[PDB]
Amino acid sequence: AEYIVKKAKQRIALQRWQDELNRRKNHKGMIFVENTVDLEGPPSDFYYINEYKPAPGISLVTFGCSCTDCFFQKCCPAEAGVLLAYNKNQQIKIPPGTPIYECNSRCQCGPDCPNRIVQKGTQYSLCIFRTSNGRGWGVKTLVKIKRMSFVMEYVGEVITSEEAERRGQFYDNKGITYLFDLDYESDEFTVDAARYGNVSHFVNHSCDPNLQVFNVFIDNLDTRLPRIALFSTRTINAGEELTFDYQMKGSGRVRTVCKCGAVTCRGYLN
Ligand SMILES: C[S@@+](CC[C@H](N)C(=O)[O-])C[C@H]1O[C@@H](n2cnc3c(N)ncnc32)[C@H](O)[C@@H]1O
Ligand SMILES: [Zn+2]
Ligand SMILES: [Zn+2]
Ligand SMILES: [Zn+2]
Ligand SMILES: [Zn+2]
């Protein structure tokens, strides 16, 4: 009875939140919201952002390449001492731990350069949905995603690692999960998606995940401050939940029990 009224208002609240997410988003794919399991409405104190929101005094970002064919000429990755990340079908072909150096605002090439993938934004329609076995909100794809494909970036506030430590003291276990050290080549900065984030803010942990982190440099060449991209590790089917390994944010208190469901589940998130 109280329940029935709450369900009815919940439906309206989730619709209004979906509409707001779609106004805020700057990428091609749609964002959907669904809760067929319980009465949870939209989270409070969460603001959708498309890119890193740096703290006061933190600056994010120029030479580019001059290729007429960035796929076959000596291009931005070459200049940085690395391989081109991508094959002709937009799939990442370099191993985890290798940085992605995409072409940038200073390169001569246009949008359809095969070295401009992360920067084009998420192409897939995705749904924030309520999980059925106690893992809160999660994210699923509504369409099939090819192996080794760009899905979404991890974004949040960009703060110092010192700030994240201090913030973490007042965070519960969930809040700590929103801290993402940018430790590719430096211990200086941390992404905090707790309050400001994109759809990656709702992606759950798995012990056999279907997404994998890569560091990305576009206009930014300072390796203290990589952008973080999530690429698929395998073919992901329509309707499938997206997951990454929270322990693999980089290659560097109650223990939360892992409910990922994998046969090889490690039992705990932390
Ligand atoms: C970054 S949040 C992800 C979205 C979150 N499920 C929500 O409702 O907003 C991480 C938190 O989600 C839950 N979670 C994610 N993966 C889980 C898993 N495999 N098993 C149990 N809980 C999980 C835990 O509460 C964890 O602290
Ligand atoms: Zn080039
Ligand atoms: Zn370039
Ligand atoms: Zn290019
Ligand atoms: Zn697990």
Residue numbers in the entry: 13 to 73, 77 to 267, 282 to 299
What's in the article?
Mono-, di- or tri- methylation of H3K9 constitute distinct biochemical signals and are established by distinct histone methyltransferases; G9a and GLP are mono- and di-methylases, and SUV39H2 di- and tri-methylates a mono-methylated substrate. The Post-SET domains of G9a, GLP, SUV39H2, but not PRDM2 include a ZnCys motif previously observed in the structures of Dim-5 and the H3K4 methyltransferase MLL1. Unlike I-SET, Post-SET is absent from the PRDM2 structure, which lacks co-crystallized SAM or SAH. It is partially folded in the structures of G9a and SUV39H2 in complex with SAH and SAM respectively, and fully ordered in the ternary complexes of GLP with SAH and H3K9 peptide. As previously observed with other HKMTs (for review), the co-factor contributes to the formation of a hydrophobic, mostly aromatic cluster (composed of Post-SET Y1211/Y1154/Y261, F1215/F1158, W1216/W1159/L298, F1223/F1166/T285 and SET H1170/H1113/H220 in GLP/G9a/SUV39H2) necessary for partial folding of the Post-SET domain. Surprisingly, in our structure of SUV39H2, Post-SET Lys-264 is inserted into the partially formed substrate lysine binding channel, which may represent some form of auto-inhibitory mechanism.
SET domain methyltransferases deposit methyl marks on specific histone tail lysine residues and play a major role in epigenetic regulation of gene transcription. HKMTs catalyze the transfer of a methyl group from the co-factor S-adenosyl-L-methionine (SAM) to a substrate lysine and, with the exception of DOT1L, are all organized around a canonical SET domain. Here we report the high-resolution crystal structures of the methyltransferase domains of GLP, G9a, SUV39H2 and PRDM2, and propose a structural mechanism for substrate recognition.
